[PDB]
Design a protein around this ligand. Structure first.
Ligand SMILES: [Cl-]
Lengths: 260, 260
């Protein structure tokens, strides 16, 4: 548990807000694991300093630098920058097992039981459910795996322009092999699904442990009324409201005195 | 194989067209199994006669009749009519194992290997992928199972108003148990997904064995140009076009001389 971690990634300040809320939500639900965040030089110094408070480890990744293992793949396929940066999660060999969570996820309950899982365990992606959604996955840091992923990234790219395509291509037995590597959908609950199959959300949505904010508007792009504790208009804003409650209650106060 | 069957359901003439195309597509791809269709008295006599040509067995279900086992459940929950009728698929104990396919599915390749599967095997539903989509499932006829399903239908209804909710509730270990009961998504490929995750469709859609026509427009509600062999406008109408090719080529000619 001391050598296990939740790992996220922020490549900018907007997603840094995501990561800060995510990390705060993990602390709120009393994870016994470490919290690590991949950051890039495009993340501002104050966001980085905030990340240093919320996270146990802030790891700077600069894929634009020739010294980075992924740099040559980035030059070949520059559009794969976010993915290549994310793949550095496999470089974190100080950890024996990690749960990667995208900075646009939100933890609603302790999910430390994810560390019982093996690489690669991920929840099904809605839309194409024989692919896993790469917003939340259990993996084992390994330079070997990292190199292998980089190699596939270089050779093939990713069928969807992101880490999800590449991770599915690499971890391609997921759909047909080992039900235990199917994380329950509630560990990576697509915010889109919270209305795409509304009866199912009503039936099973109360069990949500992780909400994954997808769609063209991320939580930080909403307006939140701190008096009514509600985002301003999707009659299930409960999750957005949790995100904003954490952001306004825990995250902003953390940054709010940086001017000092 | 002689006691195994594909089973579909038509509760009206529009879906009877679906069933006829479905059954024709199964014959086209050379199933060695029987073809059975549940029909209702709301299906016209000529549609029924067409079904008698395409299918090996046409089974009439009249849930509006007090003599039907499901009738009392129908009176209790009248909106569950389609589902209750569908559940009669479990009454077909002349078969040892069946693949149920909704009348809005379309077979693109032989799928007889589905009969290797056990009850309940179904593909994940996009949208809520810890539920299976009940458009295509492998099941074993059993009066006992039928009665148990009716009982749950009576007691609880269905969380989504259809067979899918009830079947998921009953076969609730699907998401967490036995990867072999996850049919590959290509055995029940949502027509909606054919654009909801477009990169995935491009990556894996060529493997489609069954297309499931979802959305507010069923294939028979489209206009098909027989000269250009294309439905008239979703830049993947290929599947609609297959459906219409079968309908215009095999199904309509079958009915076209009924006036005689
Ligand atoms: Cl398994």
């Amino acid at each position: 548990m001391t050598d296990q971690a939740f790992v996220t990634l922020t490549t900018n300040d907007a997603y840094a807000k995501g990561a800060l809320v995510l990390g705060s939500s993990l602390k709120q639900h009393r994870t016994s694991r470490r919290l690590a965040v991949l950051t890039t030089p495009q993340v501002s110094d104050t966001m980085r300093k905030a990340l240093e408070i919320v996270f146990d480890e802030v790891i700077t990744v600069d894929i634009l630098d020739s010294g980075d293992s992924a740099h040559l793949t980035l030059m070949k396929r520059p559009e794969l920058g976010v993915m290549l940066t994310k793949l550095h999660c496999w470089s974190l060999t100080q950890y024996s097992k990690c749960v990667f969570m995208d900075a646009d996820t939100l933890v609603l309950a302790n999910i430390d039981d994810l560390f019982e899982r093996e690489e690669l365990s991920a929840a099904p992606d809605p839309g194409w459910p024989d692919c896993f959604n790469s917003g939340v996955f259990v993996y084992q840091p390994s330079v070997e795996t990292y190199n292998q992923l980089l190699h596939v990234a270089s050779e093939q790219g990713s069928f969807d322009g992101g880490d999800q395509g590449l991770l599915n291509t690499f971890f391609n037995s997921w759909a047909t092999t080992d039900i235990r590597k199917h994380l329950p959908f509630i560990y990576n609950l697509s915010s889109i699904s919270i209305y795409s199959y509304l009866p199912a959300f009503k039936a099973f949505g109360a069990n949500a442990k992780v909400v994954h904010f997808l769609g063209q508007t991320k939580p930080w792009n909403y307006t939140y009324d701190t008096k009514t504790k509600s985002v301003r208009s999707m009659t299930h804003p409960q999750f957005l409201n949790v995100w904003w409650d954490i952001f306004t209650t825990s995250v902003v106060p953390l940054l709010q005195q940086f001017g000092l």
